Design an enzyme around this catalytic site. Sequence first.
Site, PDB file in Angstrom:
ATOM      1  N   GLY A 181      32.802  83.938   6.982  1.00 35.75           N
ATOM      2  CA  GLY A 181      34.215  83.866   7.322  1.00 35.75           C
ATOM      3  C   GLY A 181      34.932  82.779   6.535  1.00 35.75           C
ATOM      4  O   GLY A 181      34.768  82.681   5.319  1.00 35.75           O
ATOM      5  N   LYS A 192      28.779  73.113   9.863  1.00 37.97           N
ATOM      6  CA  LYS A 192      29.748  74.185   9.660  1.00 37.97           C
ATOM      7  C   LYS A 192      31.121  73.576   9.382  1.00 37.97           C
ATOM      8  O   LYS A 192      31.687  72.900  10.229  1.00 37.97           O
ATOM      9  CB  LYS A 192      29.794  75.095  10.894  1.00 37.97           C
ATOM     10  CG  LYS A 192      30.921  76.117  10.894  1.00 37.97           C
ATOM     11  CD  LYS A 192      30.685  77.191  11.945  1.00 37.97           C
ATOM     12  CE  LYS A 192      31.630  78.359  11.777  1.00 37.97           C
ATOM     13  NZ  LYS A 192      31.558  79.274  12.944  1.00 37.97           N
ATOM     14  N   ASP A 239      29.370  89.686  19.408  1.00 35.39           N
ATOM     15  CA  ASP A 239      29.005  89.945  18.018  1.00 35.39           C
ATOM     16  C   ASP A 239      27.524  89.661  17.746  1.00 35.39           C
ATOM     17  O   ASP A 239      27.163  89.084  16.718  1.00 35.39           O
ATOM     18  CB  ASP A 239      29.891  89.124  17.085  1.00 35.39           C
ATOM     19  CG  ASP A 239      29.865  89.635  15.651  1.00 35.39           C
ATOM     20  OD1 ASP A 239      30.271  88.875  14.753  1.00 35.39           O
ATOM     21  OD2 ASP A 239      29.450  90.772  15.326  1.00 35.39           O
ATOM     22  N   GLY A 271      22.346  88.980  11.657  1.00 35.26           N
ATOM     23  CA  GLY A 271      22.791  87.814  10.911  1.00 35.26           C
ATOM     24  C   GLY A 271      23.198  86.604  11.743  1.00 35.26           C
ATOM     25  O   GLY A 271      23.309  85.501  11.205  1.00 35.26           O
ATOM     26  N   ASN A 272      23.436  86.817  13.037  1.00 32.14           N
ATOM     27  CA  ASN A 272      23.757  85.746  13.989  1.00 32.14           C
ATOM     28  C   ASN A 272      22.560  85.322  14.836  1.00 32.14           C
ATOM     29  O   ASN A 272      22.686  84.478  15.723  1.00 32.14           O
ATOM     30  CB  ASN A 272      24.883  86.198  14.924  1.00 32.14           C
ATOM     31  CG  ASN A 272      26.200  86.353  14.211  1.00 32.14           C
ATOM     32  OD1 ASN A 272      26.382  85.845  13.100  1.00 32.14           O
ATOM     33  ND2 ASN A 272      27.136  87.060  14.841  1.00 32.14           N
TER      34      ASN A 272
HETATM   35  C1  LIG Z   1      19.015  75.991   0.194  1.00 29.86           C
HETATM   36  N1  LIG Z   1      18.323  77.151   0.803  1.00 29.86           N
HETATM   37  C2  LIG Z   1      19.228  78.309   0.998  1.00 29.86           C
HETATM   38  C3  LIG Z   1      18.470  79.476   1.638  1.00 29.86           C
HETATM   39  N2  LIG Z   1      17.900  79.041   2.925  1.00 29.86           N
HETATM   40  C4  LIG Z   1      18.743  78.948   4.095  1.00 29.86           C
HETATM   41  C5  LIG Z   1      20.031  79.534   4.178  1.00 29.86           C
HETATM   42  C6  LIG Z   1      20.819  79.427   5.337  1.00 29.86           C
HETATM   43  C7  LIG Z   1      20.366  78.723   6.479  1.00 29.86           C
HETATM   44  C8  LIG Z   1      21.232  78.615   7.698  1.00 29.86           C
HETATM   45  O1  LIG Z   1      22.302  79.219   7.677  1.00 29.86           O
HETATM   46  N3  LIG Z   1      20.826  77.852   8.733  1.00 29.86           N
HETATM   47  C9  LIG Z   1      21.584  77.632   9.892  1.00 29.86           C
HETATM   48  N4  LIG Z   1      21.129  76.824  10.803  1.00 29.86           N
HETATM   49  N5  LIG Z   1      21.974  76.760  11.765  1.00 29.86           N
HETATM   50  C10 LIG Z   1      23.079  77.540  11.548  1.00 29.86           C
HETATM   51  C11 LIG Z   1      24.347  77.891  12.227  1.00 29.86           C
HETATM   52  N6  LIG Z   1      24.881  78.816  11.199  1.00 29.86           N
HETATM   53  C12 LIG Z   1      26.063  79.398  11.418  1.00 29.86           C
HETATM   54  O2  LIG Z   1      26.712  79.137  12.428  1.00 29.86           O
HETATM   55  C13 LIG Z   1      26.633  80.410  10.432  1.00 29.86           C
HETATM   56  C14 LIG Z   1      27.621  79.739   9.506  1.00 29.86           C
HETATM   57  C15 LIG Z   1      28.191  78.471   9.673  1.00 29.86           C
HETATM   58  C16 LIG Z   1      29.098  78.154   8.583  1.00 29.86           C
HETATM   59  C17 LIG Z   1      29.159  79.198   7.667  1.00 29.86           C
HETATM   60  S1  LIG Z   1      28.156  80.545   8.080  1.00 29.86           S
HETATM   61  C18 LIG Z   1      24.024  79.012   9.991  1.00 29.86           C
HETATM   62  C19 LIG Z   1      22.886  78.121  10.366  1.00 29.86           C
HETATM   63  C20 LIG Z   1      19.081  78.143   6.396  1.00 29.86           C
HETATM   64  C21 LIG Z   1      18.295  78.250   5.239  1.00 29.86           C
HETATM   65  C22 LIG Z   1      16.907  77.991   2.654  1.00 29.86           C
HETATM   66  C23 LIG Z   1      17.625  76.780   2.054  1.00 29.86           C
END
Ligand SMILES: CN1CCN(c2ccc(C(=O)Nc3n[nH]c4cn(C(=O)Cc5cccs5)cc34)cc2)CC1
Length: 294
Positions: free
Chosen positions: A27, A46, A140, A144-145
């Site tokens: 988003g 975030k 939702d 992915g969530n």
């Molecule tokens: C460097 N690399 C990249 C690939 N890998 C990961 C890529 C992504 C993630 C990851 O998103 N981890 C998250 N942990 N807690 C969260 C609450 N999230 C959101 O609310 C969703 C969002 C919040 C703001 C935008 S979307 C999202 C998370 C971990 C490892 C390994 C490390």
Amino acid sequence: AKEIPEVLVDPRSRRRYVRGRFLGKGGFAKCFEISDADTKEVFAGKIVPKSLLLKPHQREKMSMEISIHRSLAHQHVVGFHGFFEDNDFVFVVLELCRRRSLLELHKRRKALTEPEARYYLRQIVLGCQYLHRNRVIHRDLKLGNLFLNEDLEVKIGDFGLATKVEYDGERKKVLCGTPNYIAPEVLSKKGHSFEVDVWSIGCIMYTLLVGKPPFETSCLKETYLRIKKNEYSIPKHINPVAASLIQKMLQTDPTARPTINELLNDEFFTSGYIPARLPITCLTIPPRFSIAPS
Ligand SMILES: CN1CCN(c2ccc(C(=O)Nc3n[nH]c4cn(C(=O)Cc5cccs5)cc34)cc2)CC1
Ligand SMILES: [Zn+2]
């Protein structure tokens, strides 16, 4: 341009967070690993630009997300560890889930083994049980969530479409946003409540077991049409006990679905092997759940 600060300071708590590795987008927000300066603990930061929050309605959605998410504390819900802001950004400090989400698992593994599906669905259902008894509808729930920490434990995140049921029997008339596994009562705009989430878990169960979503087509509106007609089929290789629970959850009539508190007592869980944990190898290689090393 307006670039994100390299160090995020919360003036109320007097905590500082060094912005580490980029994690992804979703988003209006970006996600970064951020690390407390004193304790060195790492979180998912975030960060959303206030330049995309110029309209009061968008501001209110963000505020509501924080209001709901901050009130929650459960093992299978993404931890809320704080929030703050400067003139250019909103910063939310969340539990870091290092193994991404069930979407990336699904893309790599497609259809899971039944014991894996039971393992994940159990934790999703437990998280949602907590939401629902606290009168929160997520609205939702999708792959992915559903984030995974280092031990492959599920944490429900993204409360950007979530809402609070304020009185008994309330039917929400409006859902501002476009859920992935959108329930038929939302598509028709008839009114909706907690049952929306049970429908989504039904779609997730199907996707985890079958290897694809139940209503997928080339056109998103054609997909909405199939959901209206309840036009899906369960392959015959799916075991009848699992297929039966899918069928209960994916009924058009919301009152016909089981509630979230009925789900773990279903034969799908009670009559099958639920592993206590999954090894990291399950991200990439199907587990056989052998009785001993050979
Ligand atoms: C460097 N690399 C990249 C690939 N890998 C990961 C890529 C992504 C993630 C990851 O998103 N981890 C998250 N942990 N807690 C969260 C609450 N999230 C959101 O609310 C969703 C969002 C919040 C703001 C935008 S979307 C999202 C998370 C971990 C490892 C390994 C490390
Ligand atoms: Zn709106």
